[PDB]
């Protein structure tokens, strides 16, 4: 039916960072979880769905289960910093890049790129391939916050940590009234495709990078390679199924995402991929 | 004489967090330090000086060393997450307090206290005494950024992590031109006491807490117990010693502190401490 975490054993000797909603440690089927709570003045859903799409993409993602916790809908992310594994995020790494007078929190794309090539945790080709793999995923999903504290490495010395924190994908602000507006108006819809959301990663002019523009204009062989690579792993029939099998989501929402994913896939990915394909030899 | 870190062996497999500038892991004297660089739109001094003052108050603090790399002036912090020790900040810990539907990054004082009473990493009373300890030293050093991410615990389970990131203390935005301006204009010296810095922490109404006002009107026995506890360790000669003995510091700057420290010492600490005593009986 639907999971319920309410009674599972909490682990009180563990906490989690991040500035959106609380989270606690707890066992489920003999495994530990980080259980994100929603904030309130709907990213629990983005987090579950987005990740499951990333999985279907053959990329290493955190396991995610919708469930209830004391009358609050909750996303449970399997915990990958157990068994004596520690997470160091990219931020902390970029902070070692002292020859750039810019701080690790900074998301200017070129610097981020530079640090990848200059870091010594992971073979820079592996790391660079991952990064763009992730950027494509993020493109499809509309991740508006893949900052340097939203990916990283596990140490026991290092390996890439599974993609996490996709709570910022797929329109977390959208509610049934918004889903409604957009679905009934191509103009609105378009604004949520070309203009916004934008990547948290910046150009050398300090603007957030535009998903559509960037991807349909890049000559970065690394970004282009990763398109040609992930494009085939994309399976709309599955992605829609992930959406259909989302546990609490209203129906109106469910079809907002259906539409939105088809559109993103078609007006950004398809297009960019198609050009990507055309640049060979 | 003075220390050049410039040629010391760097550890290309550890990084560090924080928004304010780069840092790298290197061996000095056979040991890891975290070496913090200055951002360039002065804090390396604040850190060094502030930690040596904290130490002299008898509190457990990171050891600081002031050196040069490549003509940079840089502060070295003895790394305390070597030997399997993993640092975990209060913020994550506060993030688990799901009952207050506020996040683990918000610095509302009451919420913070609640988390102290209700967390299972440290015996609560001990931590309530630490927090308060630190608050007092911050009052002395004038810390405007003691955020839940700026203190925490250590584990291989928990012990309190030595006070770190005190680099936001002791007027870091002030330069030789500012020091002069303050050193002359009394009205200017006044407000860097009665007006700011203010603590990052907050009251129920959202406003940040005024060091002076709070310190001299509060009936929180735990804050006051802290005052009485700490006051007798304030060694004004040793402190001015610490200022005179600072390695690259300019003299106008050296004295800006001397002044500024006497000022906070007598204008807040003394006054508040006096009221404390009289408080019993
Ligand atoms: N599956 C996981 N296992 C262990 N630690 C995790 C996991 N997922 C996240 N974390 C850690 O917990 C912190 C909070 O998780 P995260 O999903 O990033 O929360 P968030 O509030 O969405 N982060 P953000 O929005 O970028 O400030 C992350 O920064 C990681 O350090
Ligand atoms: N002595 C130490 N040993 C090991 N780790 C440390 C040490 N000091 C600080 N750290 C860690 O590395 C980070 C260093 O940043 P720190 O200098 O403490 O604050 P900052 O760089 O000013 N950023 P912030 O406090 O977020 O505004 C801290 O957040 C800790 O996680
Ligand atoms: Mg995060
Ligand atoms: Mg997020
Ligand atoms: Mg810090
Ligand atoms: Mg600081």
Curated annotation (Swiss-Prot), chains A, B:
UniProt keyword list: ATP-binding, Host cytoplasm, Host nucleus, Kinase, Magnesium, Metal-binding, Nucleotide-binding, Phosphoprotein, Secreted, Serine/threonine-protein kinase, Transferase, Virulence
Gene Ontology MF annotations: ATP binding; magnesium ion binding; nucleotide binding; protein serine kinase activity; protein serine/threonine kinase activity
Record flagged with keyword Cell membrane: no
Residues that span the membrane, as ranges: none
Family annotation (CDD domains): CtkA
Post-translational modification: Autophosphorylates on either Thr-2 or Thr-6.
Entry's induction text: Is strongly expressed in response to the interaction of H.pylori with the mammalian gastric mucosa.
Catalytic function, reaction form: L-seryl-[protein] + ATP = O-phospho-L-seryl-[protein] + ADP + H(+); L-threonyl-[protein] + ATP = O-phospho-L-threonyl-[protein] + ADP + H(+)
EC supergroup of this enzyme: transferase
EC code(s) of this entry: 2.7.11.1
Keyword Magnesium: yes
Localization per Swiss-Prot or TrEMBL: Secreted; Host cytoplasm, Host cytosol; Host nucleus
A GO BP annotation: positive regulation of NF-kappaB transcription factor activity
Sequence positions that bind ATP: 20-23, 36, 62, 78-80, 165
Cellular component per GO, a single term: host cell nucleus
InterPro entries: HipA-like_C
Comment on protein domains: The C-terminal tail (residues 301-325) is not required for the kinase activity and for translocation into human cells.
Stated role: Virulence factor acting as a pro-inflammatory protein that induces the secretion of the pro-inflammatory cytokines TNF-alpha (tumor necrosis factor-alpha) and IL-8 (interleukin-8) from human macrophages, as well as enhanced translocation of the transcription factor NF-kappa-B complex in macrophages. Is a kinase capable of autophosphorylating itself at a threonine residue near the N-terminus.
Protein name: Serine/threonine-protein kinase CtkA
Organism: Helicobacter pylori (strain J99 / ATCC 700824) (Campylobacter pylori J99)
């Amino acid at each position: 039916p639907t999971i319920d975490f309410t009674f599972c054993e909490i682990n009180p000797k563990k906490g989690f960072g991040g500035a959106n909603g609380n989270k606690i440690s707890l066992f489920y089927n003999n495994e530990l979880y980080m259980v994100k709570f929603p904030p309130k003045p709907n990213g629990c859903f983005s987090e579950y769905v987005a990740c499951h799409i990333v999985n279907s993409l053959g990329l290493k993602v955190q396991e995610t289960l919708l469930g209830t916790y004391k009358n609050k809908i909750v996303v449970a992310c399997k915990d990958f910093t157990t068994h004596q594994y520690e997470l160091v995020d990219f931020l902390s790494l970029k902070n070692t890049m002292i020859e750039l007078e810019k701080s690790g929190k900074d998301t200017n794309l070129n610097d981020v790129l530079y640090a990848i090539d200059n870091q010594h945790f992971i073979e820079p080709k592996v790391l660079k391939c991952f990064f763009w793999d992730m950027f494509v995923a993020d493109t499809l999903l509309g991740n508006f916050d893949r900052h340097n504290g939203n990916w990283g490495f596990l140490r026991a010395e290092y390996q890439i940590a599974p993609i996490f924190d996709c709570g910022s994908c797929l329109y977390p602000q959208a509610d049934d009234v918004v889903c409604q507006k957009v679905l009934s108006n191509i103009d609105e819809l378009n604004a949520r495709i070309y203009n916004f959301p934008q990547s948290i990663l910046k150009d050398d002019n300090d603007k957030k990078i535009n998903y559509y523009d960037f991807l349909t204009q890049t000559n970065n062989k690394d970004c282009l390679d990763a398109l040609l690579r992930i494009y085939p792993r994309i399976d709309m029939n599955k992605i829609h199924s992930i959406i259909d099998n989302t546990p609490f989501m209203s129906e109106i929402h469910k079809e907002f995402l259906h539409t939105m994913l088809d559109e993103r896939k078609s007006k950004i990915i398809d297009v960019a991929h198609t050009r990507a394909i055309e640049l060979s030899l």
